[PDB]
């Protein structure tokens with residue numbers, strides 16, 4: 001049956017949650033809502049509870065709310081954030097206005113681990129292996145993260161990693177000298193073309209380099225500065241890639257730049273494992289068609305000690321036909337409500 005709910009004011013709003021969740025404490029903002037840490041007395045777990053802010057404010061908001069719930073409900077993988085619970089205090093569709101999402105509370109993100117310092121090669125292997133294992137799963141369901149960065153990669157004390165915020169930033173927060181843009185594939189940063197899953201592999205390359213050196217790979221001061229930093233490392237595009245830039249304006253800008261050859265990665269990443277260098281070379285390819293995939297990267301010799309083809313699962317089919325569907329607010333809201341009430345908690 002329905003649990004008993006209790007009320008509490010936390011992040012400028014009244015949080016109404018089942019009794020099972022105790023000791024609620026603000027821990028910052030998440031995607032499209034604020035997060036509280038809590039103790040789940042039913043499971044004995046420390047949990048993160050996110051209350052979405054104005055989930056049904058507009059069509060865009062309502063569809064976004066449905067999207068996140070659909071994504072979280074589908075993900076059942078060790079290296080991907082999953083849904084422990086989803087609830088509403090509402091007793092019917094007509095009273096339904098708030099959505100609460102519950103997941104594992106994670107101790108630290110990759111920003112906290114890096115802390116301006118180099119990690120050991122074995123630590124890099126294990127961390128990057130888990131990101132790729134998670135990405136293989138996500139990509140197998142035709143989901144693209146689109147915004148992988150250290151701040152959405154979370155880790156427990158044993159360095160077991162989970163990927164947060166997949167499949168979901170404004171122009172302002174992408175402006176200037178900001179970590180929000182440093183990990184983005186050039187094709188999405190400058191809207192060169194219809195992009196796909198390979199954008200995420202670029203992001204892994206940027207993250208892996210930073211784990212190895214303790215420094216941001218492409219810390220651009222703006223979009224243009226960042227492109228110049230990228231092209232200095234990987235070389236300016238060839239005729240083959242240029243043709244694929246469907247944006248006439250973006251392609252015309254590219255051709256104005258003085259040509260530069262790809263640099264020697266062994267001279268860039270001094271002292272690094274030669275196998276790490278080789279992998280970086282295969283991830284940080286400008287033409288996205290030619291980047292190593294997650295499944296291929298798991299088989300690369302760098303992960304020899306972690307790779308197990310029988311323990312790198314793929315996802316069940318994910319129906320996202322809703323993405324091309326035009327609906328009214330109340331219709332997105334009703335779809336969302338159905339998904340809330342039909343939720344079954346994990347083992």
Ligand SMILES: C[C@H](Cn1ncnn1)Nc1ncc2cc(Oc3ccc(F)cc3F)c(=O)n(C)c2n1
Nearest residue numbers: 027030035048049050101102103105106107108109
């Ligand atoms: C490292 C990071 C921050 N932190 N808080 C306490 N200690 N470290 N931990 C953490 N754990 C879980 C989430 C969940 C987050 O979002 C959610 C996603 C899905 C969900 F069901 C519930 C959520 F709260 C989130 O946005 N952040 C930033 C998180 N951070």
